[model samples]
Target: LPVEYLQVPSASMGRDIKVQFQGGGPHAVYLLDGLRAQDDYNGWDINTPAFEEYYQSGLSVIMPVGGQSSFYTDWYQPSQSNGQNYTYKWETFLTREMPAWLQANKGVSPTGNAAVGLSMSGGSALILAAYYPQQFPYAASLSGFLNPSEGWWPTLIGLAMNDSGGYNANSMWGPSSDPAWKRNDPMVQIPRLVANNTRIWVYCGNIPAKFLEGLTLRTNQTFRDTYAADGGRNGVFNFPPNGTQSWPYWNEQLVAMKADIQHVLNG
Candidate 1:
């Protein structure tokens, strides 16, 4: 069947989170959206032909939408600006709420899945895998900002969040002195990822490019360095000669990861 729009009730957020679901075999691949995600449709469905490519391909495709500037995390408080009033419990929704519902209603297994994300969501894909390796054994990050706890990245994240949805970064993870920031950083989770031996695919477009993409490239390189230092071996880095943070590059990366996703999920 074609992609079906499903609303899984989110008790944590007190709403029904929208998801683009294509049912197939038990194993699934989750596509996490970027910073400016919309409520109507996921970027993967709107920007790329990913749903079409994976349609009935023996693996369920799960795409959750409407997590703007939330980083798909369990926020500490609700936003006080941009008419935002609800606390984000996306971590609970994705990891617990949605998975249980899928298992009950959609015939999708809660384990041995894959998650792919781009830009803001890219790091989230890895973080999810690091914490829940059994749930997401395969992960990919395309132009993801991987190092959020380093230097001035927390400030940068606040600026981006304010720009995206008038959200307060402190409301997401508390003060700069808080441990949640480090907890969410992929750099801090590298050891867990290494221990799990999760299959990771990291992609960076190029340097001397867009400021955001360039920053992401450097951060990804940092992640690669740290992972290597930790003796992580279950990852592949694709630093191609040219690329950017655009949908075209992300689509290209998706194509590049298609075979690996199939292999991992089908195993």
Candidate 2:
């Protein structure tokens, strides 16, 4: 089999995180899941041939499943509503624990990789890159919620989180007034991203003016503007005239980014 599942012990979450891995070379790409991410399997494999496609590229693919509405960030508090015993410390797991495990167990380097995600994980990919530039030199966000701390975004996020898994948005980042909102915000992290010159690929569209995709477009556009304003030059903005916020579009974008993936990981 080209793919194998590895259980990495996470000190942050106090449990083993299941990671779908395919070791092709030293370079790798972490494919993050959306808000409704399941513990059983990653949507990238269930909905798309992402694993198979990346296997051909000979770039290791790392997919960590089961972070429902977590935004892949370290939570300020554990979710009491869901009765979970562990906190959502996904940032620490992906950036610290998982990478260290990969290096020791799989011989994969902890740095110089790519982070690609969609929807909820979209903003997460950028956030990871902003903070850990060497680890994620390239990041692509397909229809991501780029700016969640502004306007009615927090309310929308809370609504989505409640509907997804009864997870509290406040637990994820604390009160809206807290600085964690800005700290985890991709828009606010533009300065760090620009300074690092991480290769960014932002994707969104005029997708029938639907509520979710419409907001995605607006946020991505603002991210584009903000990045440009901050003297960011290493970026690729792809706003197709016709695009939808679904798995099909997401799969297409990931497949189309083959060239960029090769350029960054194989450089």
Candidate 3:
């Protein structure tokens, strides 16, 4: 019922992103992963029980296989392994090439599309919606990093760099001394997002110590309230009291958000 494989292009690291397309149509959802995830397969393959069933409800799933430490952003330097230059033109890929390919080959369209991301990808999802509001009107960020310049930014970046040898947030955004960090921080991008009329659905867990779940809830509420004050519509933030920062929590969120995605797509 679906197809999956590495999307290799000579211009990229030779690997773009692995995508799975189920049930056809114009409506699609681009699912993204967190900081350390290697690809889309990593998240759906392990954590989620049924990848195919998601399409049963009439939504096409477009998952960008992997971008570990890449933050789904194009990198400025070549990877040490093959000296392959990664442009992290993921913004272009998701908004352009990938969607074009889906339309031409798999029967999908750019309008009525949605995107959902976990952890870092959660933040990426919001950023993408802000940057390309016309492309993705509906977005969800699950357990995402809201403010990169905050105290947790450095710690998360350090962990990513250590886990993935080639991972370097500094290089992606240029030097820490530069303003690129602020440029990429989603918290700073909220105003633009609000201006664009993007519908956001965000969720964070209740974990305290390790995940700082409280912070997620706080930020989620703050973002919604601030956006509401700005006259934005259709923004919802959910932080389940019993949930933790893990896949199980995300899976349930995914299930709930699916309804929201369908609502946006239908409208």
Candidate 4:
């Protein structure tokens, strides 16, 4: 099926967000992108194979477009250049407006949905699943930026805010001093994920020099250790030695994830 567009009201943007959906009814996968990516379309559409087969498999694909540098969070403060407004209210759009729209138009059962993200979005998939477990029971992250709080998240936020005129990390959390940053970080939110019984699939490749070596390793370790500690099942983390931080790798991951989605949906 061809992709369809929908405009959803977003408090974070103080306007409506444009979202894209492909495929067919019921089972769905919410796909997300990396930093500086727009939601107009997914990388997989251009870089990987066509996802139409999933539609034939009865899967609906949801893609939120045009976030740009926004990290899919509600800004804590507004900026003067953009009229003190943020361009992305990703959390609200996904959890509330987007899902409601899907249920109404696409016949997406709110109770049975999955999400997958890449790079910056990888962490986002987990974040969404952790907070709204009932909404997203299955989640996957490919080269996701997990453990943002431990690494250079503050630096990245500063850079994004500076490059984008209306971005303010403080605004995302409601206050500059709020502990929401920590609360929003996926690594810090691990406990919530465990409690929610969210199924996780994560993968990272080492060939790309631009990819964070230590962080990826640590993320893999964390997932393994966390799953073991919690005595949970259905979590998989892959650190492919031959993989790189490129579209080819992402394409392969998406294809594999399609299979994984089918397995979970059938089960």
Candidate 5:
């Protein structure tokens, strides 16, 4: 149950990204927070018992503390809509900065690591894998938007970022016409994993919440329906709109995925 901040100093913005590290070893599981991710602490560390579960498993759990509406991407410009104009180089931080630090200190393998995230970061997990195949051979996404530039996803991503942290999606990847947006799209990039020696697991649920459930369910289904045939492992769970439809069920899915990742690394 030991957890501490692994500081990542960035010359890109003259700031430090506080990454929470748990457990020990040469291998680690990258746990990404959702869209409304905070700078204070990862939601997964506070909202779930995943820390203890990982603690007992003897694997390092690496969780970056910030990124809110950043989508864990390398933004084209500073985000000023949220009143914080700063450079976001999460992709570089996780794939290079953090990885290099861990390898030099904790002895983590440069490539045999796994990344997992839910909601907003689910897509980010895949992005990391596609962009850094050698650094991340395993990836998983739970209820994430795989195709951010497809259909109405651009609108959805835009509104979600605005609503969550008053950030501008335009700064993340410019307009929808920008090729960087497609480069970050999981649905487009996941197929690239099929060519590599990659282990991919994606999970989505079709359960409705009392508020704004339609968008959530549709987005998740769109992920599976459109990209399930990518030859990556995929799963869809249907939950009726009952009391046991939210975090309870969502956590169940996370536990299962975490087990899979644990096995891949420890197996």
Candidate 6:
């Protein structure tokens, strides 16, 4: 049930971005990783039977590897802000090459795919909807940081990027003051979805870690309120701190809530 060696060329970064596919249908559900996303494999493939579970669900499952600090965006440089020389060209990969490849090979319409991502990619899922609304019509963000340019989020995001994979945020979008911060922010991007009429779903667990303060929870609420006001069919889910911000909680929830997830995807 796996389609291997599926890759797309990223001229901006000079690498064959790898993608794994399972099942097949008119819609492609793209699963993105978190801040610690590795170059080897997407966490969803190893931690959760996401592909197997969705294989027979009539939706093409997509998992792209790597993007440690790339919030799935097009950066301004070819190296980490302060770490390494590996560049990131996620926006081009997802919005351009990915859609073209999926259409040509998988028969998925280039304009209507569902995107589900956790943590870092969660906000990105939404951003993609707003930025490339025609590419992703359905978007789900779990435990996502919706507002990254507000207050101290830029500093926090920068530090976390470094810690995750020694990558630098400055290398990608430049300093938070560069307007790119607000330009690429999901909080700011959410409003744009109204025009595109994208279906939005957001989920977050309340964890008391320093990195995840009240702001994280509040941010999800803010997103819910705003999206509903925008007249979109939206859903918000909050769970107790049963699981931390990692996969144990995420995948367990994914398995336990399979039906609900399918309901959202099916719509």
Quote each prediction's TM-score: 0.95, 0.96, 0.86, 0.85, 0.87, 0.88
Q: Model 5 misses residue 150 by how many Å? A: 1.0
Give the clash total for candidate 4. 12
Which ranges in model 4 have alpha carbons more than 4 Å from their true place?
79-84, 160-167, 173-177, 207-212
Residue by residue across 1-267, what tens digits does model 2's lDDT show? Answer: 479988899988888999999889898999999999999899898899888878778689999978898999999889858887778999999999999999998889999999999989999999999999999999999888788898768888888898899999999998788898889888999998899999999888551437755576677778899899999999998888888778999999999898898987796
Q: Enumerate clash totals for all models, in the order shown.
A: 0, 0, 7, 12, 0, 1
Q: RMSD in Å for candidate 2, one decimal? A: 1.8
- TM-score of predicted structure 2: 0.96
Error of 2 at 210 (Å): 4.9
Best lDDT goes to which candidate? 2
Write down the lDDT that model 3 would get.
Answer: 0.71
Better of 2 and 4 by TM-score: 2
Q: What TM-score does candidate 4 reach?
A: 0.85
C-alpha lDDT of all candidate models, in order: 0.88, 0.88, 0.71, 0.71, 0.76, 0.76
Worst 10 residues of 5 by lDDT: 236-245
Model 6 TM-score relative to the real fold:
0.88
Q: Residues 96-147, candidate 6, lDDT per residue (tens digit)?
A: 8877887887677776777777888888888888888777777777777788
**Candidate 4 per-residue lDDT over residues 71-163, each given as its tens digit:** 666555554355543445667778887778778876777776888888767878888888888888898888876776655555565555557
Best by TM-score: 2
- Winner on TM-score between 5 and 6 is 6
lDDT of 5 by residue, 43-69 (tens): 887788777767767577888898888
- What value of lDDT does candidate 1 attain over all alpha carbons? 0.88
Q: Which segments of candidate 5 are over 4 A away from where they belong?
A: 207-222, 225-247
